Amino acid sequence: SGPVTILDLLKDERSQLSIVTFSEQLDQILGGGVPLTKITEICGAPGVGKTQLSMQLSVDVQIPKCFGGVEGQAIYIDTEGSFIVDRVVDIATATVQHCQHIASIENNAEQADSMQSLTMESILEGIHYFRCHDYVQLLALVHTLPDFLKQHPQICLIVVDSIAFPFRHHFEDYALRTRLLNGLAQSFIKLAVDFKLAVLLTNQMTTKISSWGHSSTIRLILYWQEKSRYALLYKSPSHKQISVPFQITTAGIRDVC
Numbered sequence: 683s684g685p686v687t688i689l690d691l692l693k694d695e696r697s698q699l700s701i702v703t704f705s706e707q708l709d710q711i712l713g714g715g716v717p718l719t720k721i722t723e724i725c726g727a728p729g730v731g732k733t734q735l736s737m738q739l740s741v742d743v744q745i746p747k748c749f750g751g752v753e754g755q756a757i758y759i760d761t762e763g764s765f766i767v768d769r770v771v772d773i774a775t776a777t778v779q780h781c782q783h784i785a786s787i788e789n790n791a792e793q794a795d796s797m798q799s800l801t802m803e804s805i806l807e808g809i810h811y812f813r814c815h816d817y818v819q820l821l822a823l824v825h826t827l828p829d830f831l832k833q834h835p836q837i838c839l840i841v842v843d844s845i846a847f848p849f850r851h852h853f854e855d856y857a858l859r860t861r862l863l864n865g866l867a868q869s870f871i872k873l874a875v876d877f878k879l880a881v882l883l884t885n886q887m888t889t890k891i892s893s894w895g896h897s898s899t900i901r902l903i904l905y906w907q908e909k910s911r912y913a914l915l916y917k918s919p920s921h922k923q924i925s926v927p928f929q930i931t932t933a934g935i936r937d938v939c
C-alpha cells in the first residue's frame with residue numbers, strides 16, 4: 683500500500699463524515715448530517731431558513747475533530763445578496779460556546795488546547811465568501827474552483843445559496859438552459875468526489891406545494907405548518923418521507939425541545 687500522502691489519508695477519513703446541523707432531529711433524518719462527497723439540496727419558500735441552515739453548516743464544518751467534527755473550512759457562494767454578516771457572528775459564537783462547555787465539563791487537556799484557537803473570529807476566517815450576480819459569473823467561478831481548492835485543501839463544504847436564483851429568468855434558448863444546469867450538477871459532483879467535500883445547494887422552486895435534482899443525493903424541504911418550522915426529507919437513500927420540527931434561534935438552527 684502507498685505511496686499516498688498523509689494528506690490523502692486525512693481526506694479519505696473526512697470522506698466518511700457528515701456535518702451536523704445543531705438540530706438532533708435534522709441530523710437523524712439526514713443520516714448524521716450533510717454527507718461529504720455528495721450533493722445535498724435545501725428547498726423551500728422564502729423565509730423558511732435555507733440561508734440560516736447554510737450558515738449553520740458553514741460554521742459547523744469547522745468544529746474540531748476532538749468534538750466529533752469535520753474540522754474543515756467552507757466556501758459560501760452567494761448569488762442573491764442581502765447577506766447578513768452579523769448572523770454568522772451569532773451562530774459562530776453559539777458554536778464556540780457549545781465546544782467551550784464540553785472542554786470545561788467532561789475534561790480533556792487537548793480540548794483546552796483547541797479552545798486556544800477555536801474562536802468566533804477563527805470561524806469567520808474559515809468561511810470564504812464569493813458574490814455572483816448572474817449565471818455567467820457563477821459558471822466562471824465554478825470553472826475556477828479546482829484551482830481555488832488545490833490552494834485550499836481545508837475546504838470541506840461548498841454552499842451555493844441559491845442555485846435557482848441566477849436561473850429564474852427566461853432564456854431564449856431553452857436547450858441551453860438545461861445544458862448549463864446539467865453541466866453545473868456534473869461540475870458539482872466532480873468537485874465533491876475529487877476534493878472530498880460536501881456540496882450544499884439552496885433552491886426556491888421546490889416548496890411544500892410543488893428535469894433537475896437527479897444529482898442530489900438528499901433533498902430537504904423546509905416549510906411552515908401552523909406556527910412551527912418543519913423539514914421534510916423529500917429524497918434520500920432510504921426513500922422515506924419523514925417531517926421533523928425545528929426552530930431558528932439567535933444561536934442558529936436548534937431543536938424545538
Ligand SMILES: Nc1ncnc2c1ncn2[C@@H]1O[C@H](COP(=O)(O)OP(=O)(O)O)[C@@H](O)[C@H]1O
Binds near residue numbers: 729
Ligand atoms: N436572530 C434570529 N433569531 C430567530 N430567528 C431569526 C433570526 N434571524 C432571522 N431569523 C428567522 O430567519 C428567517 C430568515 O431565514 P433565511 O435563512 O434568510 O430564509 P431563506 O429561506 O429565504 O434563506 C426569518 O423568517 C426569521 O424567521
Ligand SMILES: [Mg+2]
Binds near residue numbers: 732
Ligand atoms: Mg435565503
